[PDB]
């Protein structure tokens, strides 16, 4: 219950401080630009804190979205 595919798993040797690694960063947002919760990233209390700061920076550079558009309804 309340568990599918975890994101820390699908990847490997990444730098959580790299705010340019779009191809890696973007795995951590939902279909909308929204930053995924811990229960889906699979990051630890800390890793998540560092990634959120990283993603935020990468949004200002215009590499990651801030918000996107749901595509079913």
């Amino acid at each position: 219950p309340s568990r599918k595919a975890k994101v820390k798993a699908t990847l490997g040797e990444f730098d959580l401080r790299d705010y340019r690694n779009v191809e890696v960063l973007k795995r951590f947002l939902s279909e909308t630009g929204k930053i995924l919760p811990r229960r889906r990233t699979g990051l630890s209390g800390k890793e998540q804190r560092i990634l959120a700061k990283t993603i935020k920076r990468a949004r200002i550079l215009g590499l990651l979205p801030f918000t996107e558009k749901l595509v079913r309804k």
């Binding site: 820390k8 798993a9 990847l11 490997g12 040797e13 990444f14 730098d15 959580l16 401080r17 790299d18 705010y19 340019r20 779009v22 630009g33 990051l43 890793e47 560092i50 920076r57 949004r59 200002i60 550079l61 215009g62 590499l63 990651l64 979205p65 801030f66």
Partner: protein, 101 residues
């Protein structure tokens, strides 16, 4: 002196002449502001997640430096003073906190 990472997003539209014109001013402004320049990668242009100044693209730049702290905000100002300079993001460097590696 501290080690910063200067991010500069350029107007993707400029032909060769106009481009390396901006670069010259970029590097000049560094020399004037006491920015000893370590490594540097011009990562070309990339497709932006949202448009910046009506362009869906942006030309990218990245300078790892070492420069006097007291002169960073005034250096970041001077870099932004131009038109074809869309974003400037001066971050201070960090040890790369690896994860799940």
């Amino acid at each position: 002196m501290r080690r910063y990472e200067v991010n500069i997003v350029l107007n993707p539209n400029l032909d060769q002449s106009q481009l390396a014109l901006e670069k010259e001013i970029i590097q000049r402004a560094l020399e004037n502001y006491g920015a000893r320049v370590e490594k540097v990668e011009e990562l070309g242009l990339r497709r932006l997640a949202y448009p910046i100044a009506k362009d869906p693209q942006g030309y990218f730049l990245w300078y790892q430096v070492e420069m006097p702290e007291d002169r960073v905000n005034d250096l970041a100002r001077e870099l932004r003073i131009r038109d074809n300079v869309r974003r400037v993001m001066v971050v201070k460097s960090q040890e790369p906190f690896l994860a799940n590696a």
